[PDB]
């Protein structure tokens, strides 16, 4: 339903921002049951909550110039 507790708890567990927490859209009913940080750590270990990588900011042109 409304997943803002899971998006907030997974950001502090993964030590990232809310813009990096990826919640699986197919298992929104399973993530909705996670109400504690210990259950989020169980979902991160199962691939349902993955930390998205950093946006690329290559210094190729900065170093080539």
């Amino acid at each position: 339903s409304m997943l803002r507790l899971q998006k907030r708890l997974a950001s502090s567990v993964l030590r990232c921002g809310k813009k990096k927490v990826w919640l699986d859209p197919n298992e929104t009913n399973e993530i909705a049951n996670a109400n504690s940080r210990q259950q989020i750590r169980k979902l991160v270990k199962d691939g349902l909550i993955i930390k998205k990588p950093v946006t690329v900011h290559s210094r190729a042109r900065c170093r080539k110039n």
């Binding site: 049951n33 996670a34 109400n35 504690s36 210990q38 259950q39």
Partner: peptide, 8 residues
Amino acid sequence: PSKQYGLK
């Protein structure tokens, strides 16, 4: 079994 909740 109809109700489910995560015990803290």
